[PDB]
Amino acid sequence: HVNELSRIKLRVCQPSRSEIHFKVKMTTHLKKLKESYCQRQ
């Protein structure tokens, strides 16, 4: 089961420098960005 649907950590990912990066080209599945974790360059 999707624990983020029953818990909702509501984690927002905002880098201090956004240049060479991408994003999920699906508003519906954009929740996967707040269902996992990010990376630090």
């Binding site: 999707v2 991408f22 699906m26 269902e35 990376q39």
Partner: protein, 140 residues
């Protein structure tokens, strides 16, 4: 909350590294895919030794540190192993996203008496009340 579950909660066993966990490279159904066109050049080119889809260790760290290229176009994403059984075609986040696979048919096996095939089915101005076509979305 209709049909909700996470297949990636506990599937199989094995030993993996907690540090070796990427957060990108998921080539799932999240882009406007198209057929395209086959373009060949004046130079044959080997094309690189072709392999199989049954790749055991399918990793993809992606050195997103020493430079990079930001693309706003569609070419900013490229799905791989979606024409068959791909280990990456099940990395889906939501439980509902079976848009990662292709189902073909099967031909009879050799070593049989009597050449029994399938009817050629040649419609001749009948016009059935059943038009259109459908694809097949299978698991991974």
């Amino acid at each position: 909350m209709d049909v909700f579950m996470k297949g990636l909660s506990k599937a199989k066993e094995g030993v993996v590294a907690a540090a070796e966990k990427t957060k990108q490279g998921v080539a799932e159904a999240a882009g406007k895919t198209k057929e395209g066109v086959l373009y060949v050049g004046s130079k044959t080119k080997e094309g690189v030794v072709h392999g199989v889809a049954t790749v055991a260790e399918k990793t993809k760290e992606q050195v997103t540190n020493v430079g990079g290229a930001v693309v706003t176009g569609v070419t900013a994403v490229a799905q791989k192993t979606v024409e068959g059984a791909g280990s990456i075609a099940a990395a889906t986040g939501f439980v509902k996203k079976d848009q990662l696979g292709k189902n073909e048919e099967g031909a009879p096996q050799e070593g049989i008496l009597e050449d029994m095939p399938v009817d050629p089915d040649n419609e001749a101005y009948e016009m059935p009340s059943e038009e259109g076509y459908q694809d097949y979305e299978p698991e991974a």
